[PDB]
Swiss-Prot record:
Residues modified as N6-acetyllysine: 83
Main location: endoplasmic reticulum
Protein name: Protein disulfide-isomerase A4
UniProt entry tagged with the keyword Nucleotidyltransferase: no
Name of the gene encoding the protein in the UniProt record: Pdia4
Length: 231
């Protein structure tokens, strides 16, 4: 069946940005016979197990999104946006556009600078290494999202300086046994950090009052090969 699903209303797109937990991938095309749309559906079909795809032919939605027709638009939900990232990544797509280039752009741009690594998404989203993980109580509900973003903001400050590594926040309970195994379950701190490297080794951050500086030092020490792995 059709890999990409049609978006009928502006409210649908608003709900994705507000409620979503994953990259919003949107093909914006002139209509169902648009050669660019067909190339998009080819790309989407290939990636269908790993991402959800949407499309629209609405000039109303294109206007809202501030794009002309014939584009692939990737946006993150509000909870994953930041001062350092554009609200949209936009790629020109026409009949001549290779499906492999579409597929490449989606993979390239599907992760935010600091996303939420979950036991449900870590294989499909957080496979790239090195990966810097920041562990704490992650809760995007109305009552707890300010505090969650408080800490996410400290991570984003470091992440923007190390584009060569992937950074994510992770819930400490969700990853209880990963945290124990990192030797971090004892620590008296509400926030902890680890690095997973390309070889399969893991490095735990010396528990300290958590701030961007301390996180930046840990990543720098990692980069410089000054850390020893957990066993």
């Amino acid at each position: 069946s059709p890999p990409s699903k049609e978006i009928l209303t502006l409210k649908q797109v608003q709900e994705f940005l507000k409620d979503g937990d994953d990259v919003v991938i949107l093909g914006v095309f002139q209509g169902v016979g648009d050669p660019g749309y067909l190339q998009y559906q080819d790309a989407a079909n290939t990636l269908r197990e790993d991402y959800k795809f949407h499309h629209t032919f609405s000039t109303e939605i294109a206007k809202f999104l501030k794009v002309s027709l014939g584009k692939l638009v990737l946006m993150q939900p509000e909870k994953f946006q930041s001062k350092y990232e554009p609200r949209m990544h936009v790629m020109d797509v026409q009949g001549s556009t290779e499906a492999s280039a579409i597929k490449d752009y989606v993979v390239k741009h599907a992760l935010p600078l600091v996303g939420h690594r979950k036991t449900s998404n870590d294989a499909k989203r957080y496979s790239k290494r090195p990966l810097v993980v920041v562990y704490y109580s992650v809760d995007f509900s109305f009552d707890y999202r300010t505090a969650t973003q408080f800490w996410r903001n400290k991570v984003l400050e470091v992440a923007k300086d190390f584009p060569e590594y992937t950074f994510a926040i992770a819930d400490e309970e969700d990853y209880a046994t990963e945290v124990k195994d990192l030797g971090l379950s004892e620590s008296g701190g509400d926030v902890n950090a680890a690095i997973l490297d390309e070889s399969g080794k893991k490095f735990a951050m010396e528990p300290e009052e958590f701030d961007s500086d301390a996180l930046r030092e840990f990543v720098m020490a990692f980069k410089k090969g000054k850390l020893k792995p957990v066993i």
